Design a protein around this motif. Structure first.
Motif, PDB file in Angstrom:
ATOM      1  N   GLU C  23       0.823  -1.206   0.000  1.00 41.52           N
ATOM      2  CA  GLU C  23       0.000   0.000   0.000  1.00 41.52           C
ATOM      3  C   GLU C  23       0.861   1.261   0.000  1.00 41.52           C
ATOM      4  N   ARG C  24       1.757   1.401   0.986  1.00 41.84           N
ATOM      5  CA  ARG C  24       2.535   2.633   1.103  1.00 41.84           C
ATOM      6  C   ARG C  24       3.565   2.770  -0.005  1.00 41.84           C
ATOM      7  N   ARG C  26       2.825   1.738  -3.036  1.00 40.79           N
ATOM      8  CA  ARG C  26       1.920   2.374  -3.984  1.00 40.79           C
ATOM      9  C   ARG C  26       1.649   3.819  -3.581  1.00 40.79           C
ATOM     10  N   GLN C  27       1.555   4.090  -2.275  1.00 44.46           N
ATOM     11  CA  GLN C  27       1.375   5.469  -1.837  1.00 44.46           C
ATOM     12  C   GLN C  27       2.636   6.313  -2.004  1.00 44.46           C
ATOM     13  N   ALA C  30       1.585   7.499  -5.139  1.00 46.83           N
ATOM     14  CA  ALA C  30       0.550   8.499  -4.903  1.00 46.83           C
ATOM     15  C   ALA C  30       1.152   9.849  -4.550  1.00 46.83           C
ATOM     16  N   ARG C  34       1.170  13.317  -6.982  1.00 49.33           N
ATOM     17  CA  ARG C  34       0.876  14.510  -6.198  1.00 49.33           C
ATOM     18  C   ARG C  34       2.021  15.510  -6.230  1.00 49.33           C
ATOM     19  N   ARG C  37       1.518  16.840  -9.893  1.00 45.91           N
ATOM     20  CA  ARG C  37       0.242  17.434 -10.265  1.00 45.91           C
ATOM     21  C   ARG C  37       0.298  18.958 -10.224  1.00 45.91           C
TER      22      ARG C  37
END
Lengths: 283, 96, 51
Positions: C23-24, C26-27, C30, C34, C37
């Motif tokens: 998860e992290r 993948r984060q 993320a 970000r 962006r």
């Protein structure tokens, strides 16, 4: 004093998005991190810090239910730190998986916390009605935008739809109808899309050659949310009925097309129009 | 004649800091540093650079972190605390 | 993503590289969207957006 905290939230509701903020950034408001915190605890009845990131999550919960983004557009969008912690505090707020949360069309206001005003609050009125299946005619188009852009985008979707038809309209139909829709996905239940339909009323003029569909209005329980304010004031009126009047009146709106009832019968001065937001409600 | 005449005149004739434009509410300062200064009837930056900080911060709406934004903003532009200006106010200057 | 490589390394092949995490890590990506962006870096890539 009492004039401070009211003005701080006019910053803070407008700066609940842009600065990555804790109370240290909030400590630039005249006093220290504790004294500005001490000044908030008694003049409000809320405790500022765990409320704000929850209110920013309450700003993100309506972004989790009515905006068309996945989990990682809005993982750290509202200035968070992680996603699993964001998923964790969500369990203590809504008691539902966010994949399950945008799985169901029913949107209950359990954990949404209303935006706070230290001054006088403009309370809207309510009246519970039960409506009827009415045919109309109108076209649809979509959007993907912000929480503040829930009526900034929506101004043109009624106007060019009206002024194309007014070029071939011998009348002015005075009852307006707008329909918002929440439709989730199938691949991963974190996304959605929205098709907005404004329509022309089947009224005293029989011949209405308008492009679109004959739309039968949904039946069941509704609420007469009448209002006084201009289409830029329905921007905050939609937000004070959906940020506040679903939590503060503790009601759960039901699955279906949210019926708008504007009045174009008073269409330069800024026009203080009157409008109803007939939400399909399950009380 | 005249078109011939004027073409003959080739040979018969031919041989302020912009942020000082804005009021006090128009500088985008901190949490309470911009909206609070207008309450002392200071309607401009030019009207605010004329005074000293000793007669501003002590009103109990103006705070210690409503104080320091006079220290750094003038230091980023090169002004003084008490600078009286010659031509500060714009054409139609008012308050809100 | 496969820049400068022949094969494309998966989150379980990655799952032994830096961490067991799925998860992290993948984060981490993320944060990678970000941190790109923000509209000063994402506009060289807006020239290729015309598809």
């Amino acid at each position: 004093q009492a004039g401070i905290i009211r003005d701080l939230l006019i910053w803070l509701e407008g700066h609940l998005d842009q600065p990555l903020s804790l109370d240290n950034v909030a400590a630039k408001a005249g006093y220290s991190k504790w004294h500005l915190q001490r000044m908030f605890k008694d003049v409000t009845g809320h405790a500022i810090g765990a409320y704000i990131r929850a209110r920013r999550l309450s700003k993100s919960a309506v972004a989790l239910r009515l905006t068309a983004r996945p989990i990682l557009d809005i993982a750290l969008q509202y200035r968070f730190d992680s996603q699993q912690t964001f998923t964790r505090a969500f369990k203590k707020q809504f008691a539902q998986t966010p994949a399950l949360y945008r799985r169901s069309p029913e949107w209950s206001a359990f954990g949404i916390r209303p935006p706070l005003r230290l001054g006088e609050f403009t309370m809207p009125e309510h009246k519970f009605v039960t409506l009827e299946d009415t045919p109309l005619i109108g076209v649809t188009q979509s959007y993907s935008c912000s929480l503040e852009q829930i009526s900034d985008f929506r101004h043109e979707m009624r106007y060019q739809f009206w002024h194309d038809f007014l070029g071939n309209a011998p009348t002015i139909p005075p009852v307006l109808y707008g329909l918002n829709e929440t439709r989730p996905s199938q691949d991963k239940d974190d996304e959605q899309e929205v098709f907005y339909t404004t329509a022309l009323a089947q009224d005293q003029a029989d011949g209405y050659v308008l492009t679109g569909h004959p739309v039968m209005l949904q039946g069941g329980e509704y609420v007469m949310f009448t209002y006084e304010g201009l289409g830029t004031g329905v921007q905050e009126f939609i937000l004070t009925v959906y940020g506040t009047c679903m939590p503060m009146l503790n009601l759960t709106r039901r699955k279906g097309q949210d019926i708008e009832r504007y009045y174009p019968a008073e269409d330069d001065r800024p026009i203080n129009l009157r409008c109803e937001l007939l939400i399909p409600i399950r009380r | 004649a005249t078109i011939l005449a004027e073409q003959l005149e080739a040979f018969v004739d031919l041989r302020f800091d912009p942020i000082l434009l804005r009021p006090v509410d128009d500088l985008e300062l901190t949490v309470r540093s911009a909206n609070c200064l207008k309450a002392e009837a200071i309607h401009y930056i030019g009207d605010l650079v004329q005074r000293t900080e000793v007669e501003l911060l002590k009103t109990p709406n103006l705070g210690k972190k409503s104080l320091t934004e006079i220290k750094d903003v003038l230091a980023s532009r090169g002004l003084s605390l008490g600078m009286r200006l010659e031509n500060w106010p714009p054409a139609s200057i008012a308050d809100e | 993503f496969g820049i400068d490589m022949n094969t494309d390394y998966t989150l379980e092949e990655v799952g032994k590289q830096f961490d067991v995490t799925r998860e992290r890590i993948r984060q981490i990506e993320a944060k990678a969207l970000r941190k790109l962006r923000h509209p000063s870096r994402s506009e060289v890539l807006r020239s290729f957006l015309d598809d």
